Scaffold this active site. Structure first.
Site, mmCIF file in Angstrom:
data_model
loop_
_atom_site.group_PDB
_atom_site.id
_atom_site.type_symbol
_atom_site.label_atom_id
_atom_site.label_comp_id
_atom_site.label_asym_id
_atom_site.label_seq_id
_atom_site.Cartn_x
_atom_site.Cartn_y
_atom_site.Cartn_z
ATOM 1 N N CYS A 1 3.274 1.479 9.443
ATOM 2 C CA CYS A 1 3.229 0.392 8.484
ATOM 3 C C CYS A 1 4.618 0.024 8.022
ATOM 4 O O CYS A 1 5.473 0.889 7.906
ATOM 5 C CB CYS A 1 2.310 0.762 7.327
ATOM 6 N N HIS B 1 0.821 -1.213 0.000
ATOM 7 C CA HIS B 1 0.000 0.000 0.000
ATOM 8 C C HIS B 1 0.871 1.287 0.000
ATOM 9 O O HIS B 1 0.312 2.368 -0.180
ATOM 10 C CB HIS B 1 -1.110 0.006 1.084
ATOM 11 N N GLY C 1 1.701 5.660 9.568
ATOM 12 C CA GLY C 1 3.127 5.711 9.276
ATOM 13 C C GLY C 1 3.919 4.601 9.940
ATOM 14 O O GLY C 1 5.107 4.440 9.645
HETATM 15 O O1 LIG Z 1 -4.368 1.135 8.593
HETATM 16 C C1 LIG Z 1 -3.710 2.095 8.204
HETATM 17 C C2 LIG Z 1 -3.721 2.545 6.758
HETATM 18 C C3 LIG Z 1 -4.425 1.507 5.918
HETATM 19 C C4 LIG Z 1 -5.786 1.600 5.657
HETATM 20 C C5 LIG Z 1 -6.462 0.561 5.034
HETATM 21 C C6 LIG Z 1 -5.780 -0.582 4.646
HETATM 22 C C7 LIG Z 1 -4.419 -0.646 4.870
HETATM 23 CL CL1 LIG Z 1 -3.518 -2.004 4.264
HETATM 24 C C8 LIG Z 1 -3.737 0.374 5.500
HETATM 25 N N1 LIG Z 1 -3.042 2.917 9.064
HETATM 26 C C9 LIG Z 1 -2.531 2.505 10.307
HETATM 27 C C10 LIG Z 1 -2.033 3.267 11.320
HETATM 28 N N2 LIG Z 1 -1.588 2.437 12.269
HETATM 29 N N3 LIG Z 1 -1.731 1.147 11.907
HETATM 30 C C11 LIG Z 1 -2.300 1.184 10.709
#
Ligand SMILES: O=C(Cc1cccc(Cl)c1)Nc1cn[nH]c1
Ligand SMILES: O=C(Cc1cccc(Cl)c1)Nc1cn[nH]c1
Lengths: 304, 304
Positions: free
Chosen positions: B145, B41, B143
């Site tokens: 990720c 992503h 961030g």
């Molecule tokens: O979850 C996400 C972004 C995201 C949204 C939808 C799908 C995916 Cl793969 C990733 N941000 C996050 C912050 N802390 N942990 C995660």
């Protein structure tokens, strides 16, 4: 999202861990520049920890009696001295992995990370706090002595603790990096009882703010209190008295959530008076006191 | 003495963290040999996480669109490929700090350490577990990720997790290092609800053994049970069913304490039926399930 008991990354400190052997005793040392810091009880046998005269025991030790090993390579000891309850071993080589560092003496209520080591090798890292009775609730077996407690500000490691002893109650005692014990503890195999382990009130409030920030809000009530009213309840439950300095330090958490510090004190007062009633806050069924207000902001904002 | 939620020393993994930027999205990558692993992503804008066609989005990206920075130095990207939900960025330089490593896919109930990172820089380390619903209860902001989960056996880092997503419930989802999500989660901004978060029974028993080893024995009773009787109680309290494999794995803890696994199951059965009654076990007011039997032995013996 989420709030965890988080330790600092331990790499900078891992590069400083060495093994120190004197006679038949082996423990951990901390190698910073050309000096290895370690507990002075490395010169004792178990048969003499009962009443050691460290100055007399040290007279029988020379530079060559201190075996310092960093990884699998031996460091040459060119000097030795005792500073309070620590030995400083001058080695002929500066640790190339020496991070930017400071030696700090912390106050009770302050948290730090511990890199637990055995034989100069790291086994794990955990977060703990200097208790108001100057003990720490760690995880330390025989041979973990010389393991250190530290904090990190960007690239600077502030070493605050060196592990020396376990009290008969399973709690831990140690020194700052100048060799001065936190609390009234002495490096002797004598019964030393700890005082009252009071709860760090400002840290519980910081953790209640962290819970609100992460969605746990069930404990928020319609009440407020005063510092004097709150402190009457804090006294009753063996909680540290809350001062205006503590209120000031909670200012940024109060500003972020819009919850006045005294309103959060009233929530905590009700939690103390009524208990959790089978509920949890941030996965805990008790009030957590080993997160400072600075830890909550750091974790909640993503400081690296 | 003492038992703590302990993470592995994070140094070996810190030397692998890099920052990966694609377009306006920045996250963490893992640099092992000449490949940088990161969530796919990284090629998405927030405006397209709703329904991304990763294969189509990747067509518009070239090697030069992936900005990889290790510390303050830029890595040259000489190749890129998508393997499941991860991107593998071939760089022209092997990471000189690459530890001995393996990529493993863990089972629910297994624990690991997380080095939470932002912008390729480590912020902290904590211990967590793969929940039976294939989520993890972490501490991850936007961030984070690309942050990874891992275990260490002497000098070998087994990477088991890469963080990708936070569910609306504040729990976390991610992949193994082959890019396959744990559980049924997809890398899309769509509501994905987690299943029942059951308690890891074998881990609670291991932690009850750790408590006995460290002096907390109040919960030990005069009773015993059978696997089928215990499992009836486990079902009622949303605990994972205990099997003979779990009993076998608890064997060394049972041998060390002299407490038969089924007797410890009876203690746990009474704790579930009666609660703690205001008491604590290893500083916790709830039954801890994020210590495996292997973690308890490792910590209780001082493995480095
Ligand atoms: O979850 C996400 C972004 C995201 C949204 C939808 C799908 C995916 Cl793969 C990733 N941000 C996050 C912050 N802390 N942990 C995660
Ligand atoms: O406490 C000690 C040894 C000791 C006894 C008496 C005094 C001193 Cl300074 C040191 N062993 C320990 C294992 N884990 N943590 C500590």
């Amino acid at each position: 999202s989420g709030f965890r008991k988080m330790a600092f990354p331990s790499g900078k400190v891992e590069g400083c861990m060495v093994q120190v052997t004197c006679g038949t005793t082996t423990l951990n040392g901390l190698w910073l520049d050309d000096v290895v810091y370690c507990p002075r009880h490395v010169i004792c046998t178990s048969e003499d920890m009962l009443n050691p005269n460290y100055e007399d025991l040290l007279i029988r030790k020379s530079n060559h009696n201190f075996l310092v090993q960093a990884g699998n390579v031996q460091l040459r000891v060119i000097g030795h001295s005792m500073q309070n309850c620590v030995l400083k071993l001058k080695v002929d080589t500066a640790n190339p992995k020496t991070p930017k560092y400071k030696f700090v003496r912390i106050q009770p209520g302050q948290t730090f990370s511990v890199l637990a080591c055995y034989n100069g090798s790291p086994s794990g890292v955990y977060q703990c706090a200097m208790r108001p009775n100057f003990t720490i609730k760690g995880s330390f077996l025989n041979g973990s002595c010389g393991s250190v407690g530290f904090n990190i500000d960007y690239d600077c490691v502030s070493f605050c603790y060196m592990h020396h002893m376990e009290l008969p109650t399973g709690v831990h005692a140690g020194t700052d990096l100048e060799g001065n014990f936190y609390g009234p503890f002495v490096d002797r195999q004598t019964a030393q009882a700890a005082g009252t382990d009071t709860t760090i009130t400002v840290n519980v409030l910081a953790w209640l703010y962290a819970a609100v920030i992460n969605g746990d809000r069930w404990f928020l009530n319609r009440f407020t209190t005063t510092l004097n009213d709150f402190n009457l309840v804090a006294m009753k439950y063996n909680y540290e008295p809350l001062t205006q300095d503590h209120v000031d330090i909670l200012g940024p958490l109060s500003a972020q959530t819009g919850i006045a510090v005294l309103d959060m004190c009233a929530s905590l007062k009700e939690l103390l008076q009524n208990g959790m009633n089978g509920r949890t806050i941030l996965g805990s069924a008790l009030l957590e006191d080993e997160f400072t207000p600075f830890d909550v902001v750091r974790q909640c904002s993503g400081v690296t």
